[model samples]
Target: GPSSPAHVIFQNVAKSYLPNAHLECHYTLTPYIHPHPKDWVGIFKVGWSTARDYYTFLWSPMPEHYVEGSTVNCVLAFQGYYLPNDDGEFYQFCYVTHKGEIRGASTPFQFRASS
Candidate 1:
């Protein structure tokens, strides 16, 4: 099913990431929803139920020309010592609104090499 009324969206994201590799996210901000400073995207294990279980996060920075139907392009560099070492796990991304509600969520992806 599609979002009932998706305000935030998670763009295409890959399945696996190598150590020290960077990841990119280019979510869209449709006119249906308003952007706030609290608008942030978080990475969580597929087993999680809420945003509290996020392993890492990135703020959806507003652009200078932010207006109706705008998109935010961003990237996250997985730094050592902070990257999740938990193998055999599937993770997903979610656009948790400031009120702690999920607008859109990406399909679960694994954290492993192409073995």
Candidate 2:
């Protein structure tokens, strides 16, 4: 279903396959692609991106070590790295944004092995 512009948002975060093992990622817009203008808040306001809104980066010391059927955890992080010329340093550390503690960033979604 189409969502209101005010509902539009950009989320940048990371996910882990195991407890502090590997960090994979998944991202999506809050409202996806809003059209209305009132829903916006800031000068740029909330709305859909004219270019690209979603991005991903994968880093893991042991990519193939995730346990089967394990629950992965993830949390929204910063998008500064995605910007040009930005060094990917914080990729190794937890993100502390202006907002309060964003939980689940320490783990990835639960894994499900085939029966």
TM value for model 2: 0.18
* Global lDDT of each candidate: 0.69, 0.25
Q: How accurate is candidate 2 locally (lDDT)?
A: 0.25
For each candidate in turn, give its C-alpha RMSD to the true structure in angstroms. 2.6, 16.2
lDDT (10s digit) by residue, model 1, range 1-115? 6542466666777676553445665566766777777878887888777779898887766555667655655444445455555487888778887888877777777765555
TM-score of each: 0.78, 0.18
Overall local distance difference test of candidate 1: 0.69
Off by over 4 Å in 2: 1-56, 60-65, 75-81, 84-115
Against the true structure, candidate 1 reaches a TM-score of 0.78
- Tens digit of lDDT per residue, candidate 2, span 1-115? 3322222222343321232233333322232221221211111111323212213322212213445433323233324334222222222222211232211122212222212
